[PDB]
Write an enzyme that holds these catalytic residues in place. Structure first.
Site, mmCIF file in Angstrom:
data_model
loop_
_atom_site.group_PDB
_atom_site.id
_atom_site.type_symbol
_atom_site.label_atom_id
_atom_site.label_comp_id
_atom_site.label_asym_id
_atom_site.label_seq_id
_atom_site.Cartn_x
_atom_site.Cartn_y
_atom_site.Cartn_z
ATOM 1 N N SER A 102 0.798 -1.217 0.000
ATOM 2 C CA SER A 102 0.000 0.000 0.000
ATOM 3 C C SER A 102 0.835 1.273 0.000
ATOM 4 C CB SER A 102 -0.917 0.038 1.225
ATOM 5 O OG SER A 102 -1.991 -0.861 1.090
ATOM 6 N N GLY A 103 0.458 2.232 -0.852
ATOM 7 C CA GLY A 103 1.147 3.514 -0.912
ATOM 8 C C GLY A 103 2.365 3.530 -1.803
HETATM 9 C C1 LIG Z 1 -7.890 1.322 0.904
HETATM 10 O O1 LIG Z 1 -8.794 0.219 0.946
HETATM 11 C C2 LIG Z 1 -8.358 -1.082 1.194
HETATM 12 C C3 LIG Z 1 -7.009 -1.439 1.430
HETATM 13 C C4 LIG Z 1 -6.690 -2.765 1.819
HETATM 14 C C5 LIG Z 1 -5.233 -3.153 1.989
HETATM 15 N N1 LIG Z 1 -4.386 -2.639 0.858
HETATM 16 C C6 LIG Z 1 -4.225 -3.389 -0.334
HETATM 17 C C7 LIG Z 1 -3.412 -2.904 -1.365
HETATM 18 C C8 LIG Z 1 -3.370 -3.584 -2.568
HETATM 19 C C9 LIG Z 1 -4.145 -4.763 -2.762
HETATM 20 C C10 LIG Z 1 -3.944 -5.533 -4.012
HETATM 21 N N2 LIG Z 1 -3.515 -4.879 -5.101
HETATM 22 N N3 LIG Z 1 -4.323 -6.806 -4.259
HETATM 23 C C11 LIG Z 1 -4.978 -5.229 -1.717
HETATM 24 C C12 LIG Z 1 -5.007 -4.552 -0.530
HETATM 25 C C13 LIG Z 1 -7.752 -3.702 1.982
HETATM 26 N N4 LIG Z 1 -7.496 -5.034 2.316
HETATM 27 S S1 LIG Z 1 -7.134 -5.456 3.932
HETATM 28 C C14 LIG Z 1 -8.720 -5.498 4.722
HETATM 29 O O2 LIG Z 1 -6.616 -6.763 4.040
HETATM 30 O O3 LIG Z 1 -6.314 -4.423 4.525
HETATM 31 C C15 LIG Z 1 -9.066 -3.362 1.718
HETATM 32 C C16 LIG Z 1 -9.358 -2.054 1.316
HETATM 33 O O4 LIG Z 1 -10.612 -1.655 0.929
HETATM 34 C C17 LIG Z 1 -11.759 -2.341 1.400
HETATM 35 C C18 LIG Z 1 -12.148 -3.509 0.571
HETATM 36 C C19 LIG Z 1 -13.165 -4.320 0.998
HETATM 37 C C20 LIG Z 1 -13.532 -5.432 0.288
HETATM 38 C C21 LIG Z 1 -12.879 -5.764 -0.877
HETATM 39 C C22 LIG Z 1 -11.855 -4.955 -1.313
HETATM 40 C C23 LIG Z 1 -11.495 -3.831 -0.586
#
Ligand SMILES: COc1cc(CNc2ccc(C(=N)N)cc2)c(NS(C)(=O)=O)cc1OCc1ccccc1
Ligand SMILES: *[C@@H]1O[C@H](CO)[C@@H](O)[C@H](O)[C@H]1O
Ligand SMILES: *[C@@H]1O[C@@H](C)[C@@H](O)[C@@H](O)[C@@H]1O
Ligand SMILES: C[As](C)(=O)[O-]
Ligand SMILES: [Ca+2]
Ligand SMILES: [Ca+2]
Ligand SMILES: [Ca+2]
Ligand SMILES: [Ca+2]
Ligand SMILES: [Ca+2]
Ligand SMILES: [Ca+2]
Ligand SMILES: [Ca+2]
Ligand SMILES: [Ca+2]
Ligand SMILES: [Ca+2]
Lengths: 188, 251, 142
Positions: free
Chosen positions: B189-190
């Site tokens: 992230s970021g």
């Molecule tokens: C900024 O919003 C989110 C960031 C992250 C964590 N950051 C992150 C960064 C990149 C990726 C990836 N490219 N696969 C996957 C994850 C998460 N995942 S977590 C709970 O494990 O931390 C979720 C987020 O949105 C909420 C949400 C809810 C349901 C489905 C999708 C998204």
């Protein structure tokens, strides 16, 4: 604004025009892993020539998409692989010489839109062994056929009697669009 | 990063490591000597704002060498439209307390102009994503900076090619694979989604969210940086406001 | 075609279809068989779609069945070679050929720009670093 639809490829001897409906647009073409290239900028035609882009590599599979203007609204075309789908043009019988009991029928090595150096490659140049020609000749009430891996036929002829010929360009390995249309008829 | 490889030391010079109270928190991207672009959600649970640290020229988190440079983050600017625990406007502009020194291992990624990014970079198919995030969806993080080349998708295609979740806004874009083999991940992230064009790399995305990591039927999602260029530039020319955390209007 | 008493002569493709324009019956009177007359008639009667000279800018037309194909010269494209390749110098087309930034200009030609830390070369399209560590370059690979 409405997204284009019914995108269709119209291709023959590699002259490839993308067409669509309904009757301002911009087209992009690419290969599955290449960059997207814009074409036919803000055209009001519902067609776009993509020949120069696809002849750079006819064995490649291209995808095109038509953007619409009054991210933008757009529609993807079907995937297109020139070598496996461009329609073979109507062939032409170039000549037929007789030598006693035999007759040589020659098919013209037609040019394609595929450029190599300062020239246009022939249908033979592009498909090599992949292309054959079929001959349908008659005199008698029946028909006869002969096939060839080159652009020439050598057949037997009953002396005296008159013969008529027709040829078809064919690419046997093909699944669809495997045969060109019949050439103009030619008789002795 | 799932399915990528180690970025050779020095070939990902704008990559940033963000730590809170000395713990790995997120990635970021240097865009000049004092500014770093990261993801706003990286800060949803920060308590000790005086304890954010940005490390540049980092590579292997198990060895220390002279290419590393640390700086306290003096300011964390987030759009005032961002909501903790949600996905939209996932971006943050960080001012370092002291500028970093540009070396062979520490170099800024170019912030492009908006139209160049929209009309040209947006159509370069592949870009690199990087970070020290999880190597597997369930897994632990990586010790060596990992990098991965991912193809971009227009949103209409992303949705059509995905299973039926936040909505993909115009402030986002998808990139990656839906076959379950490659993606960035949470700990990334970021970090940067960097696009190479005619000899130069530009910042086009920020690792933001996604369903799991490299989940079949899903793509990674990234903040669409082209929508924030003016926002980032106006802020970079602004005077330092009191307090670490600042919320700036967007637009 | 048929002139006074010519039809007393047996059919001759040369005399009637080559040296003259023959109708379908005259053609059928020559090949006799239906499937043979149609095979001959489909091309004989098609017409030359190139007649109208559709290929522009020195293109070469090649006639087909109820259609044509234009082969164009290097600087041209389009179904009819009507497209000028040298007139597409706009920013949306390959970034106007600019290395970095491209600005369209209504009427005149497009201008190219560079990001801070770079300067536009005399070729009007390239950018060169003015600092030691310009953004976007990887020092150890340079
Ligand atoms: C900024 O919003 C989110 C960031 C992250 C964590 N950051 C992150 C960064 C990149 C990726 C990836 N490219 N696969 C996957 C994850 C998460 N995942 S977590 C709970 O494990 O931390 C979720 C987020 O949105 C909420 C949400 C809810 C349901 C489905 C999708 C998204
Ligand atoms: C030339 O003739 C062709 C074939 O009918 C026609 O379609 C063109 O538009 C014309 O210029
Ligand atoms: C036919 O082909 C086009 C490409 C040009 O070469 C013309 O001069 C020629 O007649
Ligand atoms: C992040 As998705 C729209 O591919 O599920
Ligand atoms: Ca280290
Ligand atoms: Ca007659
Ligand atoms: Ca007559
Ligand atoms: Ca006569
Ligand atoms: Ca004659
Ligand atoms: Ca009759
Ligand atoms: Ca007659
Ligand atoms: Ca008659
Ligand atoms: Ca014709």
């Amino acid at each position: 604004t409405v997204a284009a639809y019914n995108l269709t490829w119209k291709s023959t001897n590699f002259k490839t025009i993308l067409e669509w409906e309904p009757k301002v647009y911009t087209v992009q073409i690419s290969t599955k892993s290449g960059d997207w290239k814009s074409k036919c900028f803000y055209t009001t035609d519902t067609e776009c020539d993509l020949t120069d882009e696809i002849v750079k590599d006819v064995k490649q599979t291209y995808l095109a998409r038509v953007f619409s203007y009054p991210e933008p609204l757009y529609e993807n075309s079907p995937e297109f692989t020139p070598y496996l789908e461009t329609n073979l043009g109507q062939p032409t019988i170039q000549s037929f010489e007789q030598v006693g009991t035999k007759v040589n029928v020659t098919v013209e090595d037609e040019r394609t839109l595929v450029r190599r150096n300062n020239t246009f490659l022939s249908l033979r140049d592009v498909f090599g062994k992949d292309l054959i020609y079929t001959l349908y000749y008659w005199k008698s009430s029946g028909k006869k056929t002969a096939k060839t891996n080159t652009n020439e036929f050598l057949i037997d002829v009953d002396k005296g009697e008159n013969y008529c010929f027709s040829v078809q360009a064919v690419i046997p390995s093909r699944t669809v669009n495997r045969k060109s249309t019949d050439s103009p008829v030619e008789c002795m | 990063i799932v399915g990528g490889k180690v970025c050779p030391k020095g070939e990902c010079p704008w990559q940033v490591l963000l730590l809170v109270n000395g713990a790995q928190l997120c990635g970021g991207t240097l865009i000049n000597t004092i500014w770093v672009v990261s993801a706003a959600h990286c800060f949803d649970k920060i308590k000790n704002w005086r304890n954010l640290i940005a490390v540049l020229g980092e590579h292997d988190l198990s060895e220390h060498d002279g290419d590393e440079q640390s700086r306290r983050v003096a300011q964390v600017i987030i759009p005032s439209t961002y909501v903790p625990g949600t996905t939209n406007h996932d971006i943050a502009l960080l001012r370092l307390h002291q500028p970093v020194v540009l070396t062979d291992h520490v170099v800024p990624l170019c912030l492009p102009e908006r139209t160049f990014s929209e009309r040209t970079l947006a159509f370069v198919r592949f870009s690199l994503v990087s970070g020290w995030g999880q190597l597997l969806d369930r897994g632990a993080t990586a010790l060596e900076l990992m990098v991965l080349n991912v193809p971009r998708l227009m949103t209409q295609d992303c949705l059509q090619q995905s299973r039926k979740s936040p909505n993909i806004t115009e402030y986002m874009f998808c990139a990656g694979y839906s076959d379950g083999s490659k993606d960035s991940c949470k700990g990334d992230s970021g970090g940067p989604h960097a696009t190479h064009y005619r000899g130069t790399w530009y910042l086009t995305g920020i690792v933001s969210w996604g369903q799991g990591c490299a989940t079949v039927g899903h793509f990674g999602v990234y903040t669409r940086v082209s929508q924030y260029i003016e926002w980032l530039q106006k802020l970079m020319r602004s005077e330092p406001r009191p307090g670490v955390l600042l919320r700036a209007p967007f637009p | 075609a048929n002139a006074f008493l010519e039809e007393l002569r047996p059919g001759s493709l040369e005399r009637e279809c080559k040296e003259e324009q023959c109708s379908f019956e005259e053609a059928r009177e020559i090949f006799k068989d239906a499937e043979r007359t149609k095979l001959f008639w489909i091309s004989y009667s098609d017409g030359d779609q190139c007649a109208s000279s559709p290929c522009q800018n020195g293109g070469s037309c090649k006639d087909q069945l109820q259609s044509y194909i234009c082969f164009c010269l290097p600087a041209f494209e389009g179904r009819n070679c009507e497209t000028h390749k040298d007139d597409q110098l706009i920013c949306v087309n390959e970034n106007g050929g600019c290395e970095q930034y491209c600005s369209d200009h209504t009427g005149t030609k497009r201008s190219c720009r560079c990001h801070e830390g770079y300067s536009l070369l005399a070729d009007g399209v390239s950018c060169t670093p003015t600092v030691e560590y310009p953004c976007g370059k990887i020092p150890i690979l340079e």
